[PDB]
Amino acid sequence: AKGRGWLQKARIADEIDVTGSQYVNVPQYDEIGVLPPLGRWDPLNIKGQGEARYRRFVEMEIKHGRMAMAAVLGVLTTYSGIRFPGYLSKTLDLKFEDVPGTMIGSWATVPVTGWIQIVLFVVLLEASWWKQDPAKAPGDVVPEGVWWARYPDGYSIFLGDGSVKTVAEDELFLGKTWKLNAERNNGRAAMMGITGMYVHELLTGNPVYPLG
């Protein structure tokens, strides 16, 4: 017995016009990353360098933005003083609290054997596990069955009464295109953010130099 029969009865009916008739649905932002303010901002015309060369740049922006988002959150956490409990290296007597939260301070104090384990995990992810499929969408490197939050078109959300709403890809804050765009834009902003935090640290020792 399939356990999904209650979903259709809990599903909210399709939205109509106030008069009673069916609603008429009635633009230039089709690709993820093409947003209202600038549209398609391509000063170097990388899209004109070939479809293979443009597919490379989409995955390249997605990957660069994903590491930069994690890098920005890492510095903001460690420079604030938040640390894991315990030891980073019991052999080297390296507690988490002893390591500086600054970018250059944490880069030097973390042992190179410890840094190798981070790099090898990225190498293992890049070369075997999370490999980009040419048929799959750019940035979709997590395979099936690895428990990833997915937002397919028409996925279910639930209200207070138990009613079920299906979320299209064009829905605000909940569609796939919104979350795909927000990943790209936060990746773009963190890309400029992480290099700005690097140079402000190089000049003043403070990654967020005006603040603090």
């Binding site: 009916a13 399709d14 939205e15 016009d17 106030v18 008069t19 609603y23 633009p27 207070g160 009464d161």
Partner: protein, 64 residues
């Protein structure tokens, strides 16, 4: 009518005029939140009124 850069940007946000959920919709959920809000407003009124005396909160001027 005039088409502007910001007007084209904000156009989908004003494109769903007259669209409704058929029937009663989510009115039952709304009534529950209204009822919970009414009970909550009575609680903070009666706390201020000292009609509800809590465990160790005192409706009086506090220090620091």
């Amino acid at each position: 009518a005039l088409r502007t850069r910001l007007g084209e940007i904000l156009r989908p946000l004003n494109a769903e005029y007259g669209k409704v959920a058929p029937g009663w919709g989510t009115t039952s959920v709304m009534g529950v939140f209204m009822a919970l809000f009414l009970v909550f407003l009575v609680i903070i009124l009666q706390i201020y009124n000292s009609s509800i005396i809590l465990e160790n909160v005192d409706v009086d001027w506090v220090t620091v």
